[PDB]
Structures are given as structure tokens and as C-alpha cells.
Amino acid sequence: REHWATRLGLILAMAGNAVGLGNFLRFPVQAAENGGGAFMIPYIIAFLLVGIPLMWIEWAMGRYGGAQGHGTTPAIFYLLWRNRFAKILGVFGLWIPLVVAIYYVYIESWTLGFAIKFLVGLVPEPPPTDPDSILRPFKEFLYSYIGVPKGDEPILKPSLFAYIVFLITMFINVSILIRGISKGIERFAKIAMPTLFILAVFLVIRVFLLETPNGTAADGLNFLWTPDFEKLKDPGVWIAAVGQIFFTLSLGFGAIITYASYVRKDQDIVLSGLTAATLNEKAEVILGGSISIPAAVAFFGVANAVAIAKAGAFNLGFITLPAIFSQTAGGTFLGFLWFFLLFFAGLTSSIAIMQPMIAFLEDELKLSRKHAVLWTAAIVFFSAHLVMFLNKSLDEMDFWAGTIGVVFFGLTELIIFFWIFGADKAWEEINRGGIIKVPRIYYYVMRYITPAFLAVLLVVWAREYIPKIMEETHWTVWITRFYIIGLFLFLTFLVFLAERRRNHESAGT
Amino acid sequence: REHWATRLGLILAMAGNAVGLGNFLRFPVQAAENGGGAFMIPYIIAFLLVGIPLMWIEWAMGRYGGAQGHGTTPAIFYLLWRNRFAKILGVFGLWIPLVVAIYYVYIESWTLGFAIKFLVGLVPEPPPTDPDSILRPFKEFLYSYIGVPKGDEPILKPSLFAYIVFLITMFINVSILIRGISKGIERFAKIAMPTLFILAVFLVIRVFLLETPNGTAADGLNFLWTPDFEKLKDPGVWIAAVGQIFFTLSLGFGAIITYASYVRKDQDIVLSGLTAATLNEKAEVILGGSISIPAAVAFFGVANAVAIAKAGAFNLGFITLPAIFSQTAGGTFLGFLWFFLLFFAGLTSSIAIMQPMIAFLEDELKLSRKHAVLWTAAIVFFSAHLVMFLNKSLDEMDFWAGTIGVVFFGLTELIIFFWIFGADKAWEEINRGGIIKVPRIYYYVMRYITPAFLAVLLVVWAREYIPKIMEETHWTVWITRFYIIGLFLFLTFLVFLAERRRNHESAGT
Ligand SMILES: CCCCCCCCO[C@@H]1O[C@H](CO)[C@@H](O)[C@H](O)[C@H]1O
Ligand SMILES: CCCCCCCCO[C@@H]1O[C@H](CO)[C@@H](O)[C@H](O)[C@H]1O
Ligand SMILES: CCCCCCCCO[C@@H]1O[C@H](CO)[C@@H](O)[C@H](O)[C@H]1O
Ligand SMILES: CCCCCCCCO[C@@H]1O[C@H](CO)[C@@H](O)[C@H](O)[C@H]1O
Ligand SMILES: CCCCCCCCO[C@@H]1O[C@H](CO)[C@@H](O)[C@H](O)[C@H]1O
Ligand SMILES: CCCCCCCCO[C@@H]1O[C@H](CO)[C@@H](O)[C@H](O)[C@H]1O
Ligand code: NA
Ligand code: NA
Ligand code: NA
Ligand code: NA
């Protein structure tokens, strides 16, 4: 079995897994919608009670499974819990990352397409001036790229350029993954993360120089970092914060687990895990947090920036920021650096969420890496056509897998590892080989606090928010639900085939 | 490997494979739309130049493959042509029957649901009287059952009863298939075919007693059996006739092939094949032809009957016939016998088109029969939800697999067997063990006439009819196209897994 070559490569790869579109696109919108500073208190608490503990748990499960030649949850869950039901629940650790990949790589492809067009200056030119005469050209630019419906039919019509760029993005993901863990993902991480970090710091600096009659970047910062103890009572904020914590750390994706399955049995996961998690948080609250919001607030003021963020999920990153930049010297090139940053942030994440499927085909069905990577790419590529052509399909997939799914799976994996497998066996398994030990307090956090935290969260989520969303949707949501349910059935069938092959090889030898 | 126990069981099973909804629902509509007697000339010629020759070819390929432990075309095509491309083209022999099964079993489920409701007298009661005040109650009856859209959304809403009946139908298919070839399909065939034949003859007789001021059943017969040599110049009729010949004989479904793979290597296929084919033709032109049309013409006259048939595909069988019967003494029970006939005609066919998938999982992936049957049922059941809830999804699947697909595959299998494998090897392979030999003339028919016939047909089909259908469809057709293309990808992946398992077991031993 492959292993990470160096500890640095391991850290940077795990950091690249975590640090992605979530830091630069998702986090700003989440924080903005939920009151900025008001969002941060629950966010910080979530990182301490959920983010950190689950990270260690997933590193441990991965290293544990890897030692026995298994990198994905269908098998790993079965190792911790000898029950057929464990294999079925383990399917989510293939399904979630696959479904997420199906829309994530497409969004990643947009960042590359924009980077290219901004580089070559093939971008809209606003009139040299109300705020809308400047934004509109950029809205139309995005709308033409992805092909937003101009009529009543829920159908998207992406440009030829967007389509070809998606193919190129898939090709780029494949070229890295096909070279494996050490020579592929690890090598690229060593190049991608430093580059990523530099671009971000530069962008932060540039943004900090923004000033208009409407305000400064500093106004944005104070909005994000001013505690609002009155919102800490609203369940919606807590749900938003925990959801972002999950998505941001790649928890519940089965991705941290699969990566960790390439960590040597004895190699530390305590300090490495904590480091990777801390790296992500810095990139998120310091880098991601200091770019979009402050730029928006500088040009529009707090109130307007919040409305923009609430307007859409891609408004701030694909429309508003480039529009703002176009009003500054060298702004088109600054737009390029922004989208190039997003692309590298996307790329190092998409390889992470596709690897679980790759590891499964290799580990359980004994496919060569080449075949495992190509077939995986083929499923993601084909499935992505639903996201490219059906309006809101992306939203539906992001909800069931990337929102509900990850939290459900986080709770599931904790229960299995800390409750069923044994709290003391899990605790010892996490600390084994540790350069440092986990503080004793975290034993009771993991065993009692985290699970109770997630369970209550899911319930309150279930009672007050899921009924509204389920009942009010357009009928086309069922197309996506139907398809991704079929995907789960498909993966269940593969796990079944894997156990058959296993039983045959066992009797044969 | 399983084999058919008796020659009678073999014949009746193959006859049951062929004789189905096609004889009693499809044929009447096809003949009616295309001028009745005008349709028959091309139909007869198609049976002689396509039906018969391809039947022998598929029996031969099946027996040939079975002798080596292979019942489906991915492997069988590879035996006749050692090329990776043969395995890929062979996927259609799994895909076509699977896609057809996905809508066929659902339609079959309607016949059972209607049979039940007609038996218990839970049917509409027309006013004791314009023709429309009688038909309408029965249209609404069907429309409520399957849930025809009442608004603008292309969404179906089948009744709870219809849904539960589909589950029961799947269960019934499974209960037969799970017992295998001899104890399952063969046993049931021996019971189903005689019953089927008796019900049909009775219905024909009852129908022949129908008379109204508008005419008699005899008027219908003369319309069907009066040659119209002026339509024999219209390509559309030829296309209709050949399509019906294919669907009717189950050619291009990979179903005849899989059944024949259970015929012993030495056992005759010439006389058996011809007998099975002739049995079907009798059930079609004599039985199927003498029920719906004559009944419709008796009550409405020729002109009206043709318009009714053109109106829809299920109008004649699910609305018009029961409506007509309701005007006769014991008509509700006659309706029951009609739908019971359709159900048994459906059932013996659906087990035939699901067996190829079953044989593949058994033959190539080494699944037990139980698992192969259950997983197959699960794919068909799940996939059928598209056909149950998306308006016109059924039409789309029937077109690509059941119409275009079967003809394309018929030509493909002939080329592979008679051209690539060797015309003389194929000829000798067909005649081997024959109780009778194929007339020498059919060698040149198979080698030159049939292929040229199908090729020209497909071309004329392609130039004049496919562009219209492709261009004019509602956008929702892409949902079905997307799904069934994914199904093809899925089956291709299984064939890939099968070749890997094969290569591993070969090296292991
Ligand atoms: C392998 C699965 C193929 C499914 C059908 C894919 C059809 C893609 O079609 C392509 O879409 C692009 C984006 O709109 C267009 O710009 C191109 O002109 C068009 O050819
Ligand atoms: C680095 C990847 C570059 C991809 C270049 C894609 C070029 C798209 O091609 C262009 O598409 C336009 C819209 O359909 C057409 O108007 C142009 O004629 C055509 O050249
Ligand atoms: C809710 C989670 C908060 C984690 C903060 C942990 C800070 C470390 O806390 C320290 O842990 C050591 C080892 O257990 C002890 O020896 C120290 O007494 C304790 O202060
Ligand atoms: C395993 C795949 C499940 C996909 C969702 C299936 C939902 C079926 O839902 C059922 O449909 C019937 C027909 O309209 C209704 O009569 C029932 O009330 C309804 O529960
Ligand atoms: C042989 C199989 C019998 C299946 C019986 C299905 C009975 C359907 O059940 C009925 O459905 C109706 C419509 O939703 C409701 O109005 C009735 O209350 C309910 O009993
Ligand atoms: C177009 C297909 C028509 C098939 C009709 C075949 C009728 C049998 O034809 C007979 O075949 C025998 C064996 O080859 C010959 O000995 C006879 O001379 C010939 O008349
Ligand atoms: Na992140
Ligand atoms: Na990344
Ligand atoms: Na038939
Ligand atoms: Na049948």
C-alpha cells in the first residue's frame, strides 16, 4: 500500500484537502448571512467541540483501516463493527464524496474558465455610473457562462467554453490522481499550498487598500469580528456554523479517512491532524474572511454587502468581487489572481473527494490505479451533466450530501468508533504514535459532548427546517433525488460485489 | 449449467417469450394505423426475410454460447469475434432487455390491476347514450390509475393501487425467475401457454358474436385481410411492419439468445426455432388480430376504429375494448378475461427479458441465482419509478431500446455471426443437431438479403423519421436519455469487472 513520503507532504496534502472553495466562497457568505461577528462565536465553539474532535477520529479510523489495507468506510466500519449494517452505513463514505465531487468539480471548472478569460482580458467592460450599471455586465457574464434560464423551463445552457473547460478540469484532476498518493497528490500539494497561500495574502493586502466614499476594508473586518451575543440564541446560526465547520474541514466526506489510510500505522496523527485543521482555520477566518467581505463593504457598506451575500451563493465571488476589482487599476489581473486562487483551492480539494472512490476500487475490487482513476472520472464526468443542464440540481446535491449527509455521517462515524468499537479502544487508537497526546478533557467531549451536540443539532434541524424545504420545492428536485438515490444503490451493489470477490478469494486460498 | 428439461417446455417457454403484449396490444394498433390489409403484405414478407432467419441465428448463437457457459452477448459476441469492441457491442444485449423490462413490467402491472378490478366489479358504470358518454368513464378510469397529468407539468401520479400492484407484479416475476430455468420458467410456461391460448380463443369467439347497427366483427376481419397493393410503396409501412416483426418475435432483445443458451449443445434448434416463431405468428394474426379490431369495427365501423387506434397506444386495449364489453351481457367479466389474458401474456415475456441480466450476473460475475434475480429485480424496480412518474418516459425508452435498438442489434448480431464469424461456420452451427435442415435458399437470404434489408431500412428510417422526432420533443426526454445512457455505462462497467475477475481466476489457476 502507498504511504505519504514525507510528513510535510502529508500535512500539506491534508491541508489542501481542507482548504478549498469553502474558505473563499462558502465561509464569507455564511458569515455574512448570519451577522458576521454573531456567526463567529458559534463557529469557534463548533470548531472546538466538533471540528477538532472529529478530525482526530477520522485520522484514527483512516490510519487504523489502512494498516489492514482498507481506506474507505464500507470496510473500515465493518472492522470497527462486525455487522452487515456497518457495510451499508459505510456506503455513505463513498456516496457523499462522489455526489459532492459531481457538483464541486464543475464549480471548480468555472474558476478556471474565469481565470483564463480574466487573464486574456476577455471580460465585460462597465460604463465609465450607478452600482447596477457596473454589476449587471458581470452578472450577464456569469449567466452566459453557466447558461441561466431566460425562460420558464428549469434548463441550463452552459457555453461551449464552459463545457470544454469542465473537460480540461476533469483532465487536470485525473493527471494528478493517476500518479497516486506520493508522486501525485503529495507532490502537487507541495506546489499548490505555498502558491495558494501567497496569492491569498497578496489579495488580502490589495483588498486592505480599498477605500471609497462608502467606507474601507476595515469596516468589513469590524463587522466580521464584533461579537453579537444576542444572536447566540438563534438555532439557525448554530446550524449554519456547524455546517460550515463540517464542510470546511472536509468532515463527513470520507476524504480525511481515505487520506489518513496512507499514514503509516505508527505515524503520528494527533499533531498532524491538529496542524492540518489549524492551517485550514487560518486560511478561512484570516484569509478567506479578509477578502470578499471587506472588499464588498468598502464599496457598498455593511448593509448592502449583507444583502448581496444573501442574494446568491455565487454572487459575491463570481459577480461582485470582479465587478469591484474592475474599478481599480490592474483590476482585471487582480480578478485573474482571485480566480486562479479559487481554482488551486478547488483542485486540491476535488482530488481529495474523488480519492475515496479510487481507494475503494483499488482496495476492495482490486482495480489498478489507472482503471480506478479513469472509471471514477467517468462516473463523475457523466453525472455532472445533470448539474450542468438542470437548474438547481447543484443545490439539491449540495443539500443532501454536502449539508445534511456530512453531519449525519459525522455523528454516525463517532458512534461507531467511540461507542460501538469502544471509547477506550478508540482513545488509545487515536493517541498511539502521537507526538503529543490529546488533552484528557477531549475524551469526555468525544464520548458525550460531540454526539449530543450533533444529535440535538440534527433534531432541531429536522423539526424546523427540513419540512419547509421538502414541501416547497419545484418538481424537478425529484430528478436529482432519483439520480443520487440510484448512485447509492450502485455503490451498495459494488460493496456487495466486493464481499463476494473476497469470499471467493478466501476459499480459493 | 441448467438446461430445459423437456422439448415441450423449451418450445412453450420460447413461445411464451415471444407471445406477449405485442400480439394483443401492439399488433392491432400497428395494423390499424397502417391500413390493415395494406400492413399485412410487408408484415408477412418481413417475417420471411427477417423474422425467421434472425430467429435461427439467435437460437444458434445462444446454444453456441451456452456450450461454453455463456448466455449473454457481451461474452458470446467475443467468442464469435475476438475483439474488445465485440464486448462493448454486446452490452446492448443486456441494455435493450433491461430498458424494455423497465417499462414492460409496469404496463404488465396495469393488466393485473385491471384484471383484479374487473373481477371484483370495481369498474366504471356508463350511463344507460352517445359513444363518448360511454368511453369517457373508461378513459378516466385509466387516467386515474396511471395518473395522467391534469395540468401543465409533465408529471404522472399513479394511484396507490397501481403502485402496490406493480410491487406485486415484480414479486410474481421474481417468484418464477428465482426457481430457475426448468423448475421456474419452464414449469410456468407449461401452465401459462395453454391457459393463454384458451382465454384467447374464447375471447375471439365472444367477439365474433358482436353485432350493432354499425357493423359486425366480420367487417373488422375483412379490413385486416384485404390486400391494398397501393400502400406497399410507402416506406413508413415497411418500417412499421419490420419493427412489429422484431418486437413480436423478441428479436434484438438478447432474450431468445439467453433462453437458447440453456438448450443442450446437440439439441435441435431448427425445428424448435421455427415452431416457436410460428406459434407466435398464429397467436398474433389469428388471435390478437381477431379480438380488438373486429370488436372496435363492430361498434364503431372501420373509419372510427382506425381513428381510435391512432389516438393512442393504450386506447384500444385499456379503454375502448372494456367500454365495448360493458355494453354486453357479462361484459365486466369478459373484461376480466381480457386483462387476465394480457397479464399472462405479459408475465411470460417479462421473465424472458429479465433473464439475460440474470444470466450475465450468474455466468460472468458468478452470482448465485438468488442474488442475481434479486439484484436484477431491484434495478428494474428502482428504474421503473422514472416510467411511473415522468410523463412520456415510457415512450422514450420504448423508442431507443424497443424500436431502434432491437433493429440495430438485429443487424449487428447478423453481421458478427454470418460475416465476421464466417457464413459457413454459422450455417453449419445453425444446422448442427437439426431435426430438419434450413432450406438452402435461406443461406443467401441470411448472408445477403436480411442484412441489406435491415441496413436500407435503418437508413430510410434515419433520413426521414429520426430527425423529426429528435428535434420536436419536450426537454424532459433528456431526463430519460440521460438515465438510460447511465444504464449503458453501468453495464459496460460490469462487463469490465467481469473480464477482470476472469483474468484473476485464470492466473490464480
Ligand atoms: C457522454 C454523455 C453525453 C451527454 C450529452 C452531452 C451533450 C453536450 O453537448 C454540448 O453541450 C455544450 C454545453 O451546452 C454545448 O456548448 C455544445 O455545443 C454541445 O455539443
Ligand atoms: C483553454 C481552453 C480554450 C477553449 C476555447 C473555447 C473556444 C470556444 O469556441 C468559440 O465558441 C463561441 C461560442 O459558441 C463561438 O462563437 C466561436 O465561433 C467559437 O470559436
Ligand atoms: C473544550 C476543549 C478545550 C480544550 C483545551 C485543552 C487545553 C489543555 O488543558 C490542559 O490539558 C493538560 C493535559 O490533559 C492538563 O495537564 C492541564 O491541566 C490542562 O489545563
Ligand atoms: C426506492 C425508491 C423510492 C423512490 C420514491 C418512491 C415514492 C413512492 O411514493 C408512493 O407513490 C404512490 C404512487 O403515486 C402513492 O400512491 C403513495 O402514496 C406514495 O407513498
Ligand atoms: C390485490 C392487491 C390489493 C391492493 C389494495 C390497495 C388498496 C388501496 O387502498 C385504498 O386507497 C385509496 C386511494 O388512495 C383510499 O381512498 C382508501 O382509503 C385505501 O384503502
Ligand atoms: C424467402 C424464403 C422462402 C423459403 C421457402 C423454402 C421452401 C422450401 O423450398 C425447397 O427447399 C428444399 C431444400 O432446400 C429444396 O430441395 C426444394 O427444391 C425447394 O423447393
Ligand atoms: Na475549507
Ligand atoms: Na483544496
Ligand atoms: Na409477440
Ligand atoms: Na409472454
Asked if the C-beta of A489 comes within 8 angstroms of chain B's C-beta atoms, the answer is yes
For residue A215, the surrounding DSSP H or E stretch is strand A215-216
Query: Is the torsion defined by CA of B401, B405, B407, B412 positive or negative?
Result: negative
- What the block records as the C-alpha cell of B73 is 452477448
Helical segments of B390-433, H only: 393-399, 406-414, 423-431
Closest-CA distance, A477 to chain B, in angstroms, reads 12
- N- to C-terminal Cα separation, chain B: 21
Asked if the C-beta of A488 comes within 8 angstroms of chain B's C-beta atoms, the answer is no
Q: Resolution to 1 decimal, in Å?
A: 2.2
> Phi and psi for B91 in degrees, rounded to 5?
-60, -30
**Distance of CA B316 from the midpoint of ligand 4 (Å):** 28
Q: How many residues does chain A have?
A: 509
Atom of ligand 6 nearest to the CA of B441: 14
For residue A211, the surrounding DSSP H or E stretch is strand A211-212
Closest of B415, B476, B486, B509 to residue B156, by C-alpha: B476
Nearest CB to A385: which of B366, B482, B500?
B482
- Asked if B365 lies within 8 A of A493 by C-beta distance, the reply is no
**Distance of CA B486 from the midpoint of ligand 8 (Å):** 29
- What the block records as the C-alpha cell of B444 is 443467401
* C-beta atoms surrounding A429 within 10 Å: 19
Q: Whose CA is nearest to atom 8 of ligand 6?
A: B439
Query: Is A168 buried (19+), middle (13-18) or exposed (0-12) by CB count in 10 A?
Result: middle
* The residue to which cell 482555520 is assigned: A281
Please, are residues B386 and B393 in contact by the beta-carbon 8 Å criterion?
yes
Please, are residues A72 and A328 in contact by the beta-carbon 8 Å criterion?
no
Atom of ligand 2 nearest to the CA of A164: 4
Burial B263-297 (b: 16+ CB within 10 A, else e): beeebbbbebbbbbbbbbbebbbebbbbbbbbbbb
- What the block records as the C-alpha cell of A402 is 454536502
**Distance of CA A347 from the midpoint of ligand 8 (Å):** 5
Residues 6+ apart with CB under 8 A from A266: A432, A433
One-letter amino acid at B290 equals S
Closest of B22, B344, B340, B349 to residue B191, by C-alpha: B344
- What the block records as the C-alpha cell of B198 is 384458451
Counting DSSP H helices and E strands in chain B, the numbers are 27, 2
Distance CA B495, CA B295 (A): 48
Please, are residues B131 and B296 in contact by the beta-carbon 8 Å criterion?
no
C-alpha of A426 from chain center: 26
Residues 6+ apart with CB under 8 A from A164: none
Distance CA A494, CA A322 (A): 44
Closest-CA distance, A379 to chain B, in angstroms, reads 9
Q: What angle do CA A486, B359, B272 make, to 5 degrees?
A: 135
Instruction: Find residue B216's DSSP bridge partners.
Output: B211
**Distance of CA A309 from the midpoint of ligand 8 (Å):** 22
Closest-CA distance, A499 to chain B, in angstroms, reads 12
What's the structural domain count of chain A?
1
Q: Whose CA is nearest to atom 14 of ligand 6?
A: B439
Asked if the C-beta of B375 comes within 8 angstroms of chain A's C-beta atoms, the answer is yes
Distance CA A17, CA B200 (A): 67
Reduced to 3 DSSP states, what percent helix, strand and coil does chain B have, rounded to the nearest 5?
A: 75, 0, 20
* The residue to which cell 495558494 is assigned: A196
Closest-CA distance, B105 to chain A, in angstroms, reads 19
Please, are residues A66 and A1 in contact by the beta-carbon 8 Å criterion?
yes
What DSSP line would sit under B425-477, residue for residue? Answer: HHHHHHHTT-SSPPPTHHHHIIIIIHHHHHHHHHHHHHHHTHHHHHHS--TTH
Crossing angle of the two packed helices B92-119 and B369-389, in degrees rounded to 10? 70
Give all strands (DSSP E) within B66-225, no chain letters: 211-212, 215-216
The backbone region for A215, taken as left when phi is positive above 0, alpha when psi lies in -120 to 50, beta otherwise, is left
DSSP B226: S
C-alpha of B122 from chain center: 29
For B374, nearest residue in chain A (alpha carbons): A493
Please give the method by which this entry was determined. Answer: X-ray
> Phi and psi for A215 in degrees, rounded to 5?
145, -165
Distance CA A172, CA B201 (A): 66
Closest of A53, A47, A432, A443 to residue A269, by C-alpha: A432
Instruction: Find residue B420's DSSP bridge partners.
Output: none
Distance CA A220, CA A208 (A): 10
Q: Measuring CA to CA, how many Å separate B473 from each of A391, B355, B389, B464? A: 19, 33, 18, 16
Reduced to 3 DSSP states, what percent helix, strand and coil does chain A have, rounded to the nearest 5?
A: 75, 0, 20
* C-beta atoms surrounding B473 within 10 Å: 15
Please, are residues A90 and A75 in contact by the beta-carbon 8 Å criterion?
yes
Q: Whose CA is nearest to atom 2 of ligand 3?
A: A48
Mutate to test the interface with A, among B88, B150, B364, B493 (most CBs of A within 10 A): B493
The backbone region for B159, taken as left when phi is positive above 0, alpha when psi lies in -120 to 50, beta otherwise, is beta
* The residue to which cell 480459493 is assigned: A508
Q: Whose CA is nearest to atom 6 of ligand 1?
A: A385
Domain span at B239: 1-509
**Three-state secondary structure of A411-473:** HHHHHHHHHHCCHHHHHHHHHCCCCCCCCCHHHHHHHHHHHHHHHHHHHHHHHHCHHHHHHCC
Please, are residues B264 and B71 in contact by the beta-carbon 8 Å criterion?
no
- Asked if A386 lies within 8 A of B482 by C-beta distance, the reply is yes
* C-beta atoms surrounding B465 within 10 Å: 14
Nearest-Å Rg of the Cα atoms of chain B is 22
